[PDB]
Amino acid sequence: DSSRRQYQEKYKQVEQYMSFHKLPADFRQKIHDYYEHRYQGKMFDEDSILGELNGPLREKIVNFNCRKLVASMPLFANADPNFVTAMLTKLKFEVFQPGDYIIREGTIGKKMYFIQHGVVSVLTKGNKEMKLSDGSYFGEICLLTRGRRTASVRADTYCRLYSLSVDNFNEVLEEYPMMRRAFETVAIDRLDRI
Amino acid sequence: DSSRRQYQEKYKQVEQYMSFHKLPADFRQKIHDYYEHRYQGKMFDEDSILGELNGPLREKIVNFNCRKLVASMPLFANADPNFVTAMLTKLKFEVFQPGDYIIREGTIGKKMYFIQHGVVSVLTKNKEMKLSDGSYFGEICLLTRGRRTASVRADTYCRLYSLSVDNFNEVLEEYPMMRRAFETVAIDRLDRI
Amino acid sequence: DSSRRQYQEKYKQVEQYMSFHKLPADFRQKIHDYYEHRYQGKMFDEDSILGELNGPLREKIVNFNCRKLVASMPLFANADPNFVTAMLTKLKFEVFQPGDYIIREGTIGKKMYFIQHGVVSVLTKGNKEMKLSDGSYFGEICLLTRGRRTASVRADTYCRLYSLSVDNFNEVLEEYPMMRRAFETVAIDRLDRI
Amino acid sequence: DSSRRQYQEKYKQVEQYMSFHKLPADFRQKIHDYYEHRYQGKMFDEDSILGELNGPLREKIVNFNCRKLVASMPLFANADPNFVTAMLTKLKFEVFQPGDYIIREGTIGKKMYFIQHGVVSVLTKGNKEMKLSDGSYFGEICLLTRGRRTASVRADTYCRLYSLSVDNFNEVLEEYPMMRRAFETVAIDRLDRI
Ligand SMILES: Nc1ncnc2c1ncn2[C@@H]1O[C@@H]2COP(=O)(O)O[C@H]2[C@H]1O
Ligand SMILES: Nc1ncnc2c1ncn2[C@@H]1O[C@@H]2COP(=O)(O)O[C@H]2[C@H]1O
Ligand SMILES: Nc1ncnc2c1ncn2[C@@H]1O[C@@H]2COP(=O)(O)O[C@H]2[C@H]1O
Ligand SMILES: Nc1ncnc2c1ncn2[C@@H]1O[C@@H]2COP(=O)(O)O[C@H]2[C@H]1O
């Protein structure tokens, strides 16, 4: 079908791009593996498809695609369904590979991440490593402080995450301001542990 | 024709997307029906076509496509034709299915809707009322910048034109006295609530 | 040629669009003639092509294409060539058909127009009609005043124009502020005539 | 071969555009030569490809493509690798042809350039010409002063450059403020020589 063909064609152009730029074989394989994990052999113009729909259908789709994620977290599971929809609509799906630095300590943080599937290591230089997995989130501290990252976060396994930018976080909280407290609780607890 | 082929091909992609995401059969039927009602078996890159034209032709097209909507509302039918063209230019066509919540009470409202064809049910949580062809709703929050005073749910398929609060205010920069039309309606409805 | 095929395929889409929306025959004829005059049987992804180039080549192309326009106006012919290039780069080519309102009196004006080829009729309601043609410009008054249009301007012949937005006008004049005087002289003259 | 076909098809479109606009044969050849030097017979939708990846992979790619440029400049070679990545991510690759004015004296400057390969001539009207080549940069003075260009800079040879806008320059320096000093040192030295 057309979506399988689109993946095969797009991947051929990626191979050619990597060849043109003389990328090493190991990195070429890393890109191969990334495409397999991220797109699973099919590609869609999701923006175009979703843009063809209406609000209700888009909201039904995002809620469906994120059912498990939502179930995982009391943040979403116990909230106003209109809040959950608002936040889910803003999320960006991202895949990271083992060893990737998702967050680097000391940098200016502008995104947080919700873990759909995978394990990450949180490492504050000089402190003990802590791990987070399915149904946890991280990177909230900088969304609240507008400061610098308090720890590095690396992918231990392949990680299927949803990211949320500070502007989108704040935009949603304009409508649901009391939900900020959920994130502050976590941030405070983590800052105490650090 | 290329436009029918575009629909058929675009719809196949949508089927594959729904398959990939494992969406339930009933939802897939709902999406299929949406595409049939919204696009009627043809698809166009409207933005590209309109972008190829000039101002006069774009304005002629939007006026023609909306001529019935315009005749159906004193707002537009009795107004400066240049105001009508300015407002029509900002409208976005949207189709909603029976049961859809177009507006949810209590949310921050940033759009209003003009009913070209269809019936909606308006409810403040009491006693429902209905609006149909030639009515508009959602104006209150465009004026107040507050929260929705009622939920509005499609009873039939609804062919609507939406207008964002920013586009509303932009047009009213040039035609400020037209704001009164919307305020009259909002005041009347707030009194009824 | 690919550009000729593009025109033919694009125009078939337009025909189908017009059919779908049930536009009257006379309107369809009008659209057909517009495509012929504006595109002359060929179409290019001009944005894409120019985006593939560099500054110097883009500037050479716009200067070449506007050679006659520039020669026709002391504004451009006598000016710093860097000013001319800056202004030309901002211009948008537009074609209008006989009878078209280019500007409507009393509306908020945000663009001016340079006449490459054609004749327009300038009319302030209640006043005498006058004509402008190749090498004239109009619509400058509102760029300077930020007020309402002082006259309507309608295409008499087919008009090949270049438009310039108020923001682009002001942007160029940030760098070449003394060039504002040229437009003011013309505006002052016309206001006195009105 | 999809990328080679893309170049061949894209260039046919360019030839036809030039024919439509009646460009002289010498200019057409100049455009042909530019496409050969800039794209080298292959074209990619780089924005699309990079947009399909994640942060870590994009950063790996930009670091790889620029590693020699980085090696050549103490600015980058001795810096926090996170600063280098942040700056590299903002760079735009540009190719200029012999004789091109990259910078014109007295104009409002909004970009600087890093030389990957080529020779440029710097000339302040009335002063002695100076040359710069691989591993030098120029155009920094206006990014710091927000004033007018202190010299013209012309391509002596074909020049393969990376440009950086003033807004991107300042954005990166929000995170790495002390790195502004490197550019000020160079600017000061050059202003002294002028
Ligand atoms: N002790 C901890 N346990 C779990 N997560 C942590 C801990 N310390 C820091 N983090 C997370 O690591 C993230 C690094 O980026 P932020 O500082 O924005 O937000 C931080 C927290 O979400
Ligand atoms: N009694 C009523 N009759 C008709 N429409 C109403 C009534 N009450 C509320 N509405 C509409 O329902 C809309 C809900 O969104 P708004 O509050 O923005 O604007 C409201 C009105 O347009
Ligand atoms: N007597 C006149 N002669 C030439 N041009 C005119 C005259 N009166 C008005 N105009 C032009 O018509 C334009 C209408 O839009 P503006 O008022 O922005 O700017 C106006 C002038 O450029
Ligand atoms: N003597 C010099 N040696 C090297 N580069 C110079 C000299 N004088 C000016 N420049 C460069 O020429 C550039 C022209 O644009 P800027 O003034 O923005 O920044 C200037 C410097 O980067």
Which residues make beta-bridge pairs with B112?
B163
CA distance linking residue A188 with residue A130, whole number of Å: 16
- Residues 6 or more apart whose CB falls under 8 angstroms from that of C44 comprise C3, C6, D13, D16, D17, D20
**Letter for the amino acid at A70?**
V
CA distance linking residue D46 with residue C129, whole number of Å: 54
Asked whether residue D180 is marked as a ligand-binding residue, the answer is no
Q: Do B2 and C16 touch (CB under 8 A)?
A: yes
| CA angle C14–C17–C20, rounded 5-degree value | 150
Residues of A with Cβ-Cβ distance to D42 under 8 angstroms: 16, 20
Q: Choose among A41, A3, A39: nearest CA to B15.
A: A3
Q: Give the helix/strand (H/E) hosting B15.
A: helix B2-20
Task: Name residue, tokens 């009913």.
Answer: B115
CA distance linking residue A92 with residue A165, whole number of Å: 9
| A182 neighbors A140 (Cβ within 8 angstroms) | no
Smallest CA–CA distance, residue D194 to chain A, in Å, is: 38
- Torsion sign across C-alpha atoms C132, C135, C141, C143: positive
Tell me which chains share at least 3 CB pairs under 8 Å with chain D.
A, C
Ligand 2 centroid vs A8 CA: distance in angstroms? 50
With an 8 Å CB cutoff and a minimum of 3 pairs, decide whether chains A and C touch.
Answer: no
Q: Choose among A99, A104, A140: nearest CA to A120.
A: A99
DSSP 8-state symbol, C87: H
Which residues make beta-bridge pairs with B163?
B112
Residue of A nearest to B95 (CA): A54
Domains of chain D in sequence order? 1-66 (1.10.287.630), 67-194 (2.60.120.10)
Output the CA–CA distances (angstroms, integers) from residue D69 to A27, D75, D182, in the order listed: 20, 10, 16
**Letter for the amino acid at C51?**
G
Counted across chains C and D, CB pairs separated by less than 8 A come out at 56
For ligand 1, atom 16, the nearest C-alpha belongs to A139
Residue of D nearest to A108 (CA): D175
User: Six-digit token pair at D55?
Assistant: 């942060």
CA distance linking residue D35 with residue D44, whole number of Å: 13
How many CB atoms are closer than 10 A to CB A137?
A: 20
Q: Choose among C97, C101, C122: nearest CA to C26.
A: C97
Question: Can you give the length of chain D in residues?
Answer: 194
| E strands, A51-186, in order | 92-96, 101-103, 111-117, 120-123, 130-132, 137-138, 152-155, 159-165
CA distance linking residue A149 with residue D37, whole number of Å: 42
- Residues 6 or more apart whose CB falls under 8 angstroms from that of B63 comprise B70, B84, B85, B88
**Letter for the amino acid at A69?**
L
CA distance linking residue B161 with residue B112, whole number of Å: 8
Task: Name residue, tokens 């929050």.
Answer: B141
- Residues 6 or more apart whose CB falls under 8 angstroms from that of A126 comprise none
Smallest Cβ–Cβ distance between C44 and the set D13, D97, D107 belongs to D13
Smallest CA–CA distance, residue D60 to chain C, in Å, is: 25
Cβ of B114 less than 6 Å from ligand 2 = no
Helix orientation angle between A81-90 and A55-65, rounded to the nearest 10 degrees: 90
For ligand 1, atom 20, the nearest C-alpha belongs to A139
How many CB atoms are closer than 10 A to CB A146?
A: 10
Task: Name residue, tokens 């300077």.
Answer: C144
| D124 neighbors D105 (Cβ within 8 angstroms) | yes
| D113 neighbors D139 (Cβ within 8 angstroms) | yes
User: Six-digit token pair at D161?
Assistant: 């450059």
Q: Do D96 and C60 touch (CB under 8 A)?
A: no
Cβ of B59 less than 6 Å from ligand 2 = no
Output the CA–CA distances (angstroms, integers) from residue C65 to C40, C76, C93, in the order listed: 16, 14, 11
User: Six-digit token pair at D40?
Assistant: 């080298």
User: Six-digit token pair at B144?
Assistant: 């107040």
Output the CA–CA distances (angstroms, integers) from residue D25 to C64, C107, D21, in the order listed: 13, 46, 12
Smallest CA–CA distance, residue A88 to chain D, in Å, is: 20
Which residues make beta-bridge pairs with B152?
B103, B122
How many CB atoms are closer than 10 A to CB C147?
A: 11
The burial class, CB within 10 Å (0-12 / 13-18 / 19+), for C34 is buried
Q: Hey, is the C-beta of B44 within 8 angstroms of any chain C C-beta? A: yes
Query: Dihedral of the CA atoms A77, A80, A81, A86 (nearest 10)?
Result: -110
Per-residue 3-state assignment (H helix, E strand, C coil) for C139-180: CHHHHHHCCECCCEEEECCCEEEEEEEHHHHHHHHHHCHHHH
Strand B151-154 versus strand B120-123 pairing type: antiparallel
Smallest Cβ–Cβ distance between D94 and the set C42, C46, C54 belongs to C54
**A137-138 β-sheet, strand order:** A92-96, A159-165, A111-117, A137-138
Mutate to test the interface with D, among C53, C62, C93, C160 (most CBs of D within 10 A): C53
- Torsion sign across C-alpha atoms C3, C8, C9, C14: positive
Q: Which atom of ligand 3 is nearest the CA belonging to C148?
A: 17
CA distance linking residue C66 with residue C88, whole number of Å: 8
Query: Dihedral of the CA atoms D126, D132, D138, D141 (nearest 10)?
Result: -40
Q: Determination technique for this PDB entry?
A: X-ray
| A128 neighbors A103 (Cβ within 8 angstroms) | no
- Torsion sign across C-alpha atoms C100, C105, C107, C110: positive
Question: Can you give the length of chain C in residues?
Answer: 194
